[PDB]
Design a protein that fits this description.
1 chains; about 80 residues; alpha+beta; globular; RNA-binding; GTP pyrophosphokinase
RNA sequence: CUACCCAUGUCCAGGGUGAAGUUCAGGUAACACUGAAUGGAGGCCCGAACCCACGCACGUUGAAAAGUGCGGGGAUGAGGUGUGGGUAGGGGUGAAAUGCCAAUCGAACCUGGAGAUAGCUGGUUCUCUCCGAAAUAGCUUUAGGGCUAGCCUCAAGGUAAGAGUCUUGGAGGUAGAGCACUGAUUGGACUAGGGGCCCCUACCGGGUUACCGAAUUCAGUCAAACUCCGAAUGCCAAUGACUUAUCCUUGGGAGUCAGACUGCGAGUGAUAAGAUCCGUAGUCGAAAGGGAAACAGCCCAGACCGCCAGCUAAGGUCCCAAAGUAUACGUUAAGUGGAAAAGGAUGUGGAGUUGCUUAGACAACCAGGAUGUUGGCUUAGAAGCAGCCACCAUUUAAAGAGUGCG
RNA sequence: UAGGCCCAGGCGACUGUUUAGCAAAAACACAGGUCUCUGCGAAGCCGUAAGGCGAAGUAUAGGGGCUGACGCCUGCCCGGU
RNA sequence: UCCUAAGGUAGCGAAAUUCCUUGUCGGGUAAGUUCCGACCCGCACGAAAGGCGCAACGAUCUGGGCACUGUCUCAACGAGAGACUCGGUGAAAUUAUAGUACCUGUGAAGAUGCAGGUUACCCGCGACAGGACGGAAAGACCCCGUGGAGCUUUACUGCAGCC
RNA sequence: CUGGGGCGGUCGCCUCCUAAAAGGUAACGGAGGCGCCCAAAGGUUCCCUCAGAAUGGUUGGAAAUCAUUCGCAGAGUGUAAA
RNA sequence: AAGGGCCAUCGCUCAACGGAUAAAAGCUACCCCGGGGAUAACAGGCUUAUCUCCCCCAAGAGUCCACAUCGACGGGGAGGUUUGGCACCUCGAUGUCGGCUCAUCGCAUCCUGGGGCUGUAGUCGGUCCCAAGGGUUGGGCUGUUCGCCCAUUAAAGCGGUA
RNA sequence: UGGUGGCGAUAGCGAAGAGGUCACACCCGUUCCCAUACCGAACACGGAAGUUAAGCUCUUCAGCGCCGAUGGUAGUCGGGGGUUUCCCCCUGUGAGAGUAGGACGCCGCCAA
RNA sequence: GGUACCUAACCAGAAAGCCACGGCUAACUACGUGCCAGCAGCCGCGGUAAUACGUAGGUGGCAAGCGUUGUCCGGAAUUA
RNA sequence: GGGAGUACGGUCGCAAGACUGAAACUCAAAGGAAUUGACGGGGGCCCGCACAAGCGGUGGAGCAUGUGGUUUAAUUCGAAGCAACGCGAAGAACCUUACCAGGUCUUGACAUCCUCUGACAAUCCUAGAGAUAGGACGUCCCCUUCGGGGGCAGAGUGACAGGUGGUGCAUGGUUGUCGUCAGCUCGUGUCGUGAGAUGUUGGGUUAAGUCCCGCAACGAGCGCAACCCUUGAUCUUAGUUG
RNA sequence: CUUAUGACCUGGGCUACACACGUGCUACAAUGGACAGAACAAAGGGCAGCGAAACCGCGAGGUUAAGCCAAUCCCACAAAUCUGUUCUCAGUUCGGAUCGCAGUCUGCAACUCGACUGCGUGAAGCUGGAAUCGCUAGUAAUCGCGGAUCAGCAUGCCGCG
RNA sequence: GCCGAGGUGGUGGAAUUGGUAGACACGCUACCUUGAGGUGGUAGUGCCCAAUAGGGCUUACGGGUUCAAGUCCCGUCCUCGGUACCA
RNA sequence: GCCCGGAUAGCUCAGUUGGUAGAGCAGGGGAUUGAAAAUCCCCGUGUCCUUGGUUCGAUUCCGAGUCCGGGCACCA
RNA sequence: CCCGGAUAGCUCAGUCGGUAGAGCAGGGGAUUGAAAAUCCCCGUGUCCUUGGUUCGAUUCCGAGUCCGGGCACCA
C-alpha cells in the first residue's frame, strides 16, 4: 500500500515545470550563472568529479566523469571542468 | 361382521344455562326503546346408562388372533342400536384411510384352465474299477443365463506324423544403453537482435552494461506414446541326431464360462490392500502326508491296499516334541535374535589410510596471557566486547586488536 | 364420588369422521363464498338396448369442480395448453 | 439498459416453509439451538393449491408461571397376586451327536471344539442374562429376474363412449 | 454396461501406447480420428526436387515474389495416427 | 397374365451399431414373489490417503540468546477412535445413533505423588520425564454426541470394549 | 583409358595435386526432328575452333562420416536366499557406450 | 446599657459604583475587528470605513446600590 | 400561524371513517381588501430589417487578428450574455513596458522645502552588457548703489517624494445600454380614512405625450420635432493657383 | 508599501501551441486566368516634410535633384470597366499558403520579432453539417484610393469616390 | 463435487454462421441551441502511437490446430441455471 | 506519604526505549464573485510541558520540579 | 403423393400476344421560432433460368431448386 503511495507520488516532477528554487549550484569553472543541467546518463554527485559538456544547444550536461558516455566523447574540447560548489 | 342406505318401532338418570317470543308496568304522536314477570329454544353445559378408543400401566407360547384395570371425549341429534330387506369383485361402498366387503383388500373367496411359468433356490437314493477338466476368448437387453471355439472322456482310422534337447537359419524392436530424430532440460563461452542508463537528439546520429537475448557451439543430464543401437529368453522353422509316444481326422457324450493366492513382468491406486485388470509359472480348486505352533492358496511331496522293516527331502537335533549339550572359528550381552524408519550415538568386531610419535607426543601440573595502540567509532564508554575496518606486524620460546565470556 | 387453574403462540372457525386390529390430527366433512355445465325426455349417472334413479323435482331447482364460518380482502399476464 | 404474453400490488415475513444458522437485536432464565416481540441479502411466502387478523372451541400442538407432588437426588417399608417350598394335574417354541472352562494366536478375517498355555473334585437348587452371530419371520431396506400387481401422462398400439 | 445401484460418462469402426523384442490379452487405464472425399487427388507415359536458413535486393515489413549457395530430409504425403 | 425366383440393384445413425417388434416413456413410503452377502448401508476385517499423538533438520521469533518457549519451507514415523478406500465373513436377518443401569481396560495424564530445566524472586506458572493405586461435579438449551453457557471443584482427562 | 555390373560409405564427404594425342567431357550453333507454362539452361538437332580449369579418372591424408574388436561392466534365461517401492550369491549368456584398430575401393564383363 | 442621647476637641481627612449610549429610549465618537470572534427583549446588527461586536475617551441613567434572572398583575379593549 | 382536525381516551358503525378533541415543539408572523408596478404558453390596438418575400456572407479551407485554456522565468493588468472577444493599443524589435532574470540604487528618477558652495556641463580615456563608474581636460552664473537677489549645480538634513500597490459594492468625471425608443414628473384644484388616483385616460390621427376633440381638471417643465450642419436648385457679390 | 510594491540598465517576454472560439480578408474559377491597348474619380496629406524629371537596377529601389509652407509642386500613372489576343473545365495557365535561396529599405540593431520585392516551391480547398448574420436605393455586394497611428511596419479601423 | 450455459469498448448487449467487424442503444467527447441549465441538433467516439496515411494491440486467461479462430480444441479462473439420491 | 506513564501542530492523531516529525480535518493561497457555496487547484502551517543533564545531533534515555492519570498505605 | 411463397433496396401486386406497378426505404424539395409524423418529386427491376409455339412474347408451354400444409409408404 505504501508502494502504491510511490505509484501515487508521480507528480513530484510536476513542480519541475514552472521553474524550481535553484542557486548557482553547479559552478562552471569559477564562473557563475550559466545554463547547466543534471545529467540523466548518471547522476552528478561528489564521487568522482563532475564535468560539463558543451552541447550543441538546449543546455549543458554535467556528465559526472567516470561515465561511459563522458569517456567516449568526440570533441573533448566541449568538456569543461566545473565545480560542484 | 362391516361401509353407507331403505321402511320400521325403540331407548337417553338428574342438575345447570337461559335466547326468540309472550304479558304487565314505564316510555314515546305512534313504532323504536326500558324494566319486571312469564316462557322455555340450544349439532348449548356438567355428569350415569349407553356408545367411543386417548394417555400411561398390564398383557404379548396372553383370560383374550386386539382385551381388563385407574382415569378420558360425546351423551336431544350430523346421535346410539334391535328387527326386516337393497347394492358383488375389472365391482360395491366410502363426512376419504386407498379403510371396509366375514380374524383376508393397492383388487375379496372357492373349485376350475393347472403338474401354469420360474434363465431362480432347495432336493436328486447301490458299489468298485478306468482315465479325466475348466472359470478364459468372441457374440448376446446378455453380464450369475445361453451357443459356437478352447481344455476332457468313449469309438474308428490314417499311422509315427507329436513333444523335449542339440544343431544352423531367421522374424521381432522391450530391459538395458544412447541423445544422432523427437520432445524436455542444466551450465558456460559467444551473439544476431531487442529494449533500457540514456548521450549526442527529426524514434533519427551511437555509445553503453553482466538489462535480456534467438541462433551458435563446448560439456551436461532425461523418456509409457525418443530411437542411429540393442541382449537374454520366448515363437514360427528347416535339418539331422538322441530319448521318448502323442498327434490329427470322423462321430456319440459332456461339464466349464463367478475363481483365489505367492514370486517375477506392467497398468489402475497413494509405486496403499489378503484391492482390482492381465501377462507368463506354480500350487489350490479337484491333492491327503511332513515342516511353517495350529493354516486350501508359501516351502518339501503325490495316498491301489497290508507289516511291530530299510533310506533320504523341506525342516529339525536342551526339554515338551523323534534325533549331537557334536566339531572348528568368530560375533554380539540386547533377551537383540523373539517389531519398524529418517536420523541420533567415544557400543563394539575386522580392515585400510596417514598426522602425532625418547633430540619424547596426548591428558594434567608450573610459568608466560606482549608491540604499534588500553584502538575508534554510532554513542554517555568498548583494551574487538551495540559493530565495524586493516585480516596489519615486530617483541618473542610464544600471544589472535582475538577463542570466548559477561 | 363427582372441574386443576392462569399467561400467551401458531394450525384448524366451530359439534362432528376415518387410518375394525400402530397412526383422532394441522387431514376430511361443514355452513357460506364462488366460476361453470343443464329448458325438462335436462345435464350428470348406472352402463350396448329397456326401465324409471335425478324427481310424484323444474334455474330461489339439480349434478360437477375449486376453496372453507364471519370481518378486511381476491392485483398483473390470453403467448403455450 | 437488454428480455418477456406479464414481470409479485395489498397484507404477512428465519415461517408447519430458512440452506449458511443457534442469523443478528431485545424480553422470558443464574444459564434458553426450542418459545414470544421486532429486523429484512423472502436460498424457495403470497392472494379462493387462497392471503392476512380473529372472541368462542379441541384426549391437537409448542412455551412460560402458580398450586401440589417418590418423577428425581436416595431409596425405605407395608399389604396382597405370581415367584421359591409340600401333595394334585401338566404342555410349548426350539432341538446335528455332545463328558460343552478362558486367555491370547490363527482361520470364510468376531471360537465351546483345533494350536499354545492358564486354571478347574462330582452333582443339583435360587437368581442375573455377557455368549452360542441366543429362538420366532428362506429380509421388510438393497440390487438382479428380461419376475408381477396397483398408479401415471404430451411412451406405444388399442377399445368403450360421446362426436 | 457399472469397484452397491441412481444420475453423470460410454456403446461399432481406424491408428498408437500399455503388450512383458512373434501374434493376441483386459480396466469407467493414457492420447486423437471416422459416418468421407476425389472425374484428378485414379490409369500409364515421361519429366524433377523439398523445408528453412544465409545473402543480394522497389513497394517489402518478421514473414509475398526473384535468383544465389548450404542443404538424403527437418517438408510434402486428399484426412487422424503409426 | 398375375406374381415368384435368378442377376444388376436403391430405401434404416436399426448409434444400445450381430440389428429381439413395422411401432415405447414414467413412480411406488401401499407394496408383493422367487433369489443374493455373487452386490451395498451398521459393525467387524486389511490398508492408512485423510485423523490426533510424536519426533528429524534447523531459518527465524524470543533485547541479545536457534534449542525457557515457539518453531516456517521441508523430511521421516507410530497409533487404528474419525472422514474414507477394498467388498472378506454376515441379506434361511448380526435390531442402528443419544441418555438411564453396571462398570471394566489401556496411558499419549485433567487432579493428586515424585522430580529436571526454565525467560523458576516469592505465590502462581510453562515444559518434557517416572507414574494407572484412587477420583473425575450439578444444571439451562439441544433427540442429542460435540459445543456454548451458569455455578463449582483439587480435577472436570482422552480413548476403547459389535 | 572408356562403357557397364555386383559388393553394408571399408565405395562417404573434405582438402591437396596430376592428367588429357585420341577417349570422355565441357565447349560452338538452332537450317532441320523435338523442346522449354518463358528460353537452345536442360531436353533434341547437328558441328569440332580451344579447353584441362569443371566433371571424369590417377595419386597422396584419418579432419568429419563409416567399420570394428579384445578386456570388463550393465541388464539377464534358469538355480536358490534376504532387510521386499528394491536387492544379494552361483551356473550360463552378454550388449550399448568407450576404445586398440581397420579403412579416403574391391571384384567382374566388353572396347581402345 | 454609660446604649440612645447631649457637651466640647480633631482633620478634606474614612468613604461610588454598576447599567445604558442605531430605532423602542435620554445620550457618540476613535481604535480594534472582517459571516469570524461576538451582541440580541423587540425590529434585527458584523463577508474591510460596526454610532448595534470588543476597547478607550466622552456622555446619559440611577445611587448604597445597579443590572440580569424567575414569578405574578398591568399596558393586553389580546376572554371584552 | 404551523404542529392538526393529528395523537390519545371514549361513544357510533358491518367497515371505510365520521363526531367530541388536545400537547410537547416552532416561527414573529402566516392571511384581509386595496394601489402602483413588473410579468402571463390571457385578450385588444400598434411598432422596428424583427419576421415573411430577396440578396450577400459567417460556421468547411488556408492565413491575418482577438480572448480562451494550456504553457513556460514571466506569457503585464483590465473588459465576461446581447451591452467583452480587429477591444482599451489611432500601431508589443529596444524603447512602449507594468511583467521575468541578471546588474543595480536608497531624501530618492521626479516636487517643495530648508543649509551652503560655486555655472554645471561638454568631450574622450579605461572600464563594463549598460545603468553606473573612475578619470583626463575644462567649470565661463548673471543682476545690483558690494550686503544681496535670480537660478542652476552638487553636498547634506529631516520633512516628505513615490507607487501601472489593492477595492469602480467608497467616488468624481467619463462613455455603452435598453433606444433617438414616446415616454418621466411637477404646480394648483379635487378624488380616496390612506397608499395612490386624476392631468398623461376616452374619440380621431401621426414618425412621435404628433395634434385635435371629449374629459374633474386647468396648466407648466424635461423630452419629440424644429432653429445646427451636409447634400440636393437658383440669384447677388467675388474670379486666381480655378 | 518603502535600501522596496520605488527608481535605473541590459536582455527576455507581451508574438508560446496538443486544442476550441469569435472577428476579418485571399480563394475554390470561364461573369474566370494571362498579355496588350484605350479611357474615367472623390476626399485627404506634405518642412529635416514631400520628393518630380532624369539616369541605373528584372524589381522592391538606388542615385542625384527641380518644384512645393501648397486649388501652383509632389504623393497619384487609380482599380474594377472597355476592346483584342490566348486559355478550355482539371486540383489545372485557378489557387497562393507553407517553405528554400537571393535581395531592398528604416533603424544602434529585423535571431526570437518587421514590411516588401526577385527566384523557386506549389498544399489545403472544387461553395462548406446543424444553426446563424447583415441590409429599403446609391443602401446590398463589389473595386481601388486617401489619412490618422508611426523611424519602421494594416487583411485593422476611420474617410473617400 | 459432476454436468449445462456464459466470460467484451465506459455500460448493457447482439456478431456463435468461417474469413478481418469489436452492431445497436446508452454513455463520454468538442461544437450548435438556451441568459447559464436540462433538453434537443450535427460530427466523431475500443484501447495506443502517427494533427494526416498507416501500424501495433487485443473479445476472461493459458496453450494448441489453422493461411486462418470472439467462435475450432484443451487446461486454469470467475459467475449463473440444474443435480448431489437410496439405507 | 508512596511509587509507577502521558505531558506532540489550529484541532484530532503517527512518530517510541535515539533520526526534529507525519497524517486527517480545519484553516490559509489565488482564479470568481458583495463575499460566500459551487467549480480550478496549492500549502503543514510544531516552545515535541518546562528546568537541567552524561554530547560527536535527542520528541523519547536520566534526574529535578510542575502537571495529569492511578492504586496501595497511613482511624485521633 | 398434392397444395402453398421465386421482381424495384425491401415488402408485394398484377393482364385473354406487344409494359415495368403500389407501400416502406433511399435521394432531395418545400413546410415549420426547431423536431418527427405527415405533403410532392424522380428514383432503381432479364418480373428466376433454359428451350419451344410465335412477329418478339413477366405473359407461356417443354425442363428443375428451396421454404410451409397434409393423405400416406419406412425393412
Amino acid at each position: 500500500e505504501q508502494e502504491k503511495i510511490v505509484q501515487e507520488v508521480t507528480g513530484e516532477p510536476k513542480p519541475y515545470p514552472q521553474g524550481r528554487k535553484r542557486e548557482a549550484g553547479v559552478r562552471v569553472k569559477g564562473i557563475d550563472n550559466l545554463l547547466v543541467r543534471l545529467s540523466k546518463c548518471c547522476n552528478p554527485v561528489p564521487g568522482d568529479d563532475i564535468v560539463g559538456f558543451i552541447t550543441k544547444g538546449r543546455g549543458v550536461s554535467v556528465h559526472r566523469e567516470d561515465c561511459p558516455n563522458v569517456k567516449t566523447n568526440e570533441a573533448q574540447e566541449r568538456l569543461i571542468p566545473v565545480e560542484w560548489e
